[PDB]
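User: My advisor, Dr. K., asked me to get a structural model of this assembly before our group meeting. I'm new to this, so sorry if the format is off. These are the inputs:
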Amino acid sequence: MLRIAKEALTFDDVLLVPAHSTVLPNTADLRTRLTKNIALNIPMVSASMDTVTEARLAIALAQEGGIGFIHKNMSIEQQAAQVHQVKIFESKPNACKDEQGRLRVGAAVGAAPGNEERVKALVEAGVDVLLIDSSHGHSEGVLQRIRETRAAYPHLEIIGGNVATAEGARALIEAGVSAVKVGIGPGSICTTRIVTGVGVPQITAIADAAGVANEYGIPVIADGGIRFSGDISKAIAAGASCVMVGSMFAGTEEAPGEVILYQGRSYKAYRIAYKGHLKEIIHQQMGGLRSCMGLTGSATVEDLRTKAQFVRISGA
Amino acid sequence: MLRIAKEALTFDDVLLVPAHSTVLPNTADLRTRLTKNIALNIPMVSASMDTVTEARLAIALAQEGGIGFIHKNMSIEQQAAQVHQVKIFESKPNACKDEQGRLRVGAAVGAAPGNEERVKALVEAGVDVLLIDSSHGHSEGVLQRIRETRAAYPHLEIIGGNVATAEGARALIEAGVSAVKVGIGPGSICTTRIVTGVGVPQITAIADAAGVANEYGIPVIADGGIRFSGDISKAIAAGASCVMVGSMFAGTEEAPGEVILYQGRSYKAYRIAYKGHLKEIIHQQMGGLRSCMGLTGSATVEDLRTKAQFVRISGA
Amino acid sequence: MLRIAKEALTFDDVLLVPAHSTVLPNTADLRTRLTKNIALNIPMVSASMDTVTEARLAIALAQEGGIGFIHKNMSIEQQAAQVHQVKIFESKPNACKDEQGRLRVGAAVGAAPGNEERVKALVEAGVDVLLIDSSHGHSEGVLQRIRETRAAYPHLEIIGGNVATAEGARALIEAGVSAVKVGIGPGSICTTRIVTGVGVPQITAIADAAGVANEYGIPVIADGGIRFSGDISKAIAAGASCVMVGSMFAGTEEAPGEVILYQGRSYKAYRIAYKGHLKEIIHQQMGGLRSCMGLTGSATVEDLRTKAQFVRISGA
Amino acid sequence: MLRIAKEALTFDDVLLVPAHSTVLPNTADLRTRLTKNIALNIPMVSASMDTVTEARLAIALAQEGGIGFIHKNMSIEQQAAQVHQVKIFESKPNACKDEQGRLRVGAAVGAAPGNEERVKALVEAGVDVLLIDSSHGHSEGVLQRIRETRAAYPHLEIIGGNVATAEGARALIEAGVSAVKVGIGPGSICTTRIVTGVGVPQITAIADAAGVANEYGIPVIADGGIRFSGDISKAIAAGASCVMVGSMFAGTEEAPGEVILYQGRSYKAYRIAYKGHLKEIIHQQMGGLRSCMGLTGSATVEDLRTKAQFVRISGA
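Assistant: The format is fine. Below is the predicted structure of the whole assembly, which you can bring to the meeting.
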């Protein structure tokens, strides 16, 4: 009677299984793909949020091997100048760089009509990848905007999202995206779920999206619901090529905002706890992933993504 | 050995699945049905509780497109005068009105013998729909009272309830109701469950009742267990044509009770927190439903009710 | 690989289903059986605990229609004198009485060798039913003591317990008991479970025991894990003819202990909160059961026990 | 789509089933095996942690019938002198002793290359069993070190670990271990799970490892996730021959550290609550196991391990 498509799993419903291994944490290879034609050295990209990514964080992340997405809450000119500032930026052996030896950078735009001028300025400033972000990637208007952008820029790497289903992933692929970003109500008690009743637990969302996207060689980016480094491992093993994070980098030295002192503690203000330099965070998070790769015998990210197994666990 | 009819699901066991959509939140159509012959403009009706619905709230809700049920804890004459006050009440484009251009209103009576005089006064005051409320709609005495009322008023829209099963819905339909109200121990830790051991999780209760009621074109009204706007969406997708709420409207300006100040805060007394004007509540709750309809591609309430899908989730 | 006999359910895993009913709470018939040859007027008996049952509580409970089990932590002579005091005790239309018009009473003894003198004094004082209590009714020594007692007193009603399985119920029946008492680690976080790892969720324990005991006409008594009146209903619907309670009656006026005042509140000391007269407790607990019987259409206890249905629910 | 090997159970998902019994708690036989050729009198061994086991605790545990593993965080000479101190140590009828009448003792070493000198000193000091401990027993380097040690000391009892799967147990057996130690992310919220995403609920881990190890006569030692004595019972019934504990013995008189007074309480410092003498702990924990053996009719540890049954329970 009730129309239940299936049962859906989140991070806490599963654990990775240890396996025969010739991989040590320090020999694990963290390289992977953001898009069809863009390699990463670590599987982390930063969210296009105005408390997370401007040029300075985008530089610092690229130097550690990820890519940052410059946020769209600023003028066209400011957004293009920040993209440009990352591309011309000149001890960092894992730096994520293009074919021309420049730090990679991404930038976000909205899916509403009228963003053409912004896209054009971003591409002319040398952006490596354009993110069309939306709260509903399976919306026809979003699909339409992606197709228009792919036609106007046939060689531009474009990430479209967010979706949480096989059919949503396929629609984005058919609209021309270079990667599928996944996450609709991915957090266990998030606003979307509470307010709308809509959501898909993220391990199932990633796997369903990856099952389609794998057949085209198109990466899936996991966006949301990550609380601990162990969730990164799980998101990859479910099918994701990398993870997007936001609040985890908000509050770092390199993130926007000014440090202020308030009641004997340090916050960033525009208030979020001060987290020190981005790279210490990356080191701790990637130190968990590397241990997982040791325990699972995953030499490469792709081995974790396509071969590692899970067990299903109870609440207890 | 144990006589278990089936497993039963509540709101928290499920989430709605996002889908291809050409619907924006602001173009979603919230119209639906309360009864077989009564249309609503929004899918909300108010409970016949003495802290929730008298004429003033019933007017204000009807103006926003719902219908209120005037409570029976007052004299026959007072109840009829309040029905009349709504019907003659004269900027509200979504107002819920009858064929004669008057605001719709409902009124409740009990299912005990001896309520004949009350029903007669309510029908003569112009009531649009009579609610026979009971804590057990599958009780023979309730079925009998409904059949007596249907025979005495063959064209009166009558809501009977509450039931929580297919067979209870069918019994009410066979007794002559125009809509089936659903909810027996619908709340996760309610008094009925704790004290009696009886209850049916509401998503399953709605679906089982709707599976019968759909075959007769008879709407199901979901009554109880709603905590957030996202639960409204889920109740509709499970089969309900609209939701009845109570405590959510108690404490509004338009609800009964006098505002009083107590320890620097505003309460309503007859003590419940003051919630401001009813319409702000409706706007927030229907703003969640409209977002859900966007995310699910549901152009109309009936699309959400009959086509949207769920996923089943764990506790974790 | 793991030797799992089955999944087992507790009270919180299930709810009773409402059904067509011609039963009102006040016409529900609460009569039932304690043992094969002893009728009760309500389905409650009191535990043989020294904070719960001596003669005074046993009198008061019998007057309301249950039976109390006088505890064994006192001399033979004192125990026999308390049994006698109940039997000769002379406005209580539901009183539980024997064939001779005397209030019924039970009494407990241990299952160790050497209790013969105690049993003999109790039977000579007129006890209606002997409870051989043990923490493991499937222990051979307990079975042996029951068989010895049945042989020495072929017409004495004997309750043996506790068991939590079909095979344990059958063993007790084959040893000669007149009723099977059920409950091994029945509480969700009890000492037995934590300390020993052993336990059986009580709804499954009752049902498994009843599935055997029904075939011999032998009642099952549910002992433990009851927190609310709704659990009484569930225990009966799972197969139990009545429930034994303990802490629920401890602290009543009629229970042992002296009332004392401590920090502006009343306790019973030998410290447990003062609960007033036993009969108010019985009235509230049986008021829940009667509502359940109305909602389920159960005219009699046996209808609830053998026909009412459950639904299985999640944690959420 | 998602690669889920199976569902996995932890201690809280299961309970032991009571059964016909001729065993009393005081007649239960607690003997078992640590390794293929080493008997224990109780099923407890202590962890090779520097807050848990040095010579003094190892002596005291051996006297109660277990075996302690002297930790490796000290010089070769100190470790060998502590092994020797236990072997020459001279009212304890359950003492665990070798063929020569000396208290048994174990000692740990790491799995890195270069521990040869340490192993040699430990074997020459008379160690009964060598533990090669690792956080990943299915790592090739660990398997290789075990095989090298087995070849150099063909008659030395060697415990290898930790694994959490059938295949990991088989690999360790094929590398030459005398017992398999089990536990990879065995605790419900441990660091390994949170940080790496890897883990196997312990009841399933034990059973899977035992299903392989039983076919070779090789014992499984359960290491981690034990909170209460009831978990010991469950770990044995899942397949384990004994349990290793750590924090449970930390803080005992006999464990390392000096007692200090801090804010009116006693702690051990190197800060952990003071627990008194080891033997009181053993008595309480083995008193739970003995009650379980009574309730399950398990005369011996091997009966609990190979015949006792479980039920599966919900969260509720």
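One thing worth pointing out at the meeting: The two ends of chain B are 30 Å apart (CA to CA).

User: Perfect, thanks a lot.
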